[model samples]
Target: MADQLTEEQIAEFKEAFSLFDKDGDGTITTKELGTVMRSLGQNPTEAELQDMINEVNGTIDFPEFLTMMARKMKDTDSEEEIREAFRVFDKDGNGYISAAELRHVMTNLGEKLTDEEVDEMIRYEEFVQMMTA
Candidate 1:
């Protein structure tokens, strides 16, 4: 069984949680979750949304929602999965993903990342640069 996420992963989860917790209420409702789904190009039916809520053992609290999202992210994308994605993007087998490659991969996932943004993602050594500069 996977343990609770590392601090880094938890930070990522918090960012996602903040985005989903619209209105700054610190909780997510089905309606809020629907917006996120639609943003991802998934138009789930109301019944489908309810089913998902039920499946995740819905809670109206942010912590519960965080747990749900954490589990979902983990189940859908493991570290190995990320590496495979990197492999797919690093077409040259050069071991370093480039801006163009990153953009292409993101486009497939409904995100139109710009070259600059992709470049920023590719240059990961400078954490401060990535976060603020």
Candidate 2:
């Protein structure tokens, strides 16, 4: 399970794990569990935390944390990262990328495109799908 992460990703999550590992203990305690989810932008309810704890049945070790992160990275990209990637190209802050702006950005990225294709590309949902899909 831990094999999913690359060496660099493993090192990164290693550092992340140690941040809340506290006291140099090899495992993360329930005390640190609260901080763990919060640090990851989650504020799960006590009941929710209990359910999570039920899955592990106790403290999370380095191997468990590594597996969790590897699965998480594959399953979801942070919404903020996706939104911010789309944000810079909007140019006018209209909450939608304009057809012209799309053309300009796509062309700049060396994608030779037709006006018709850029017109097809301007919808809000697929703008995200286009990027990370």
Model 1 per-residue lDDT tens digits across residues 11-112: 765676666665746645666666765664546778856765775422456555566556756755664564565455445336544545444555455355
Global lDDT of model 1:
0.56
The candidate scoring highest on lDDT is 2
Q: Provide the overall lDDT of each model, using Cα atoms, as 2-decimal numbers.
A: 0.56, 0.61
TM-score per candidate: 0.40, 0.47
Residues 35-119, candidate 2: write the lDDT tens digits: 7877867566798566556555456766555555655664454554566666666554466546565556565564666756665
CA deviation > 4 Å runs, candidate 1: 1-6, 20-24, 40-48, 55-59, 78-133
- Candidate 2 pairs with clashing backbones: none
lDDT of 2: 0.61
Give per-residue lDDT, candidate 2, residue 88.
65
lDDT of 1 at 9: 69
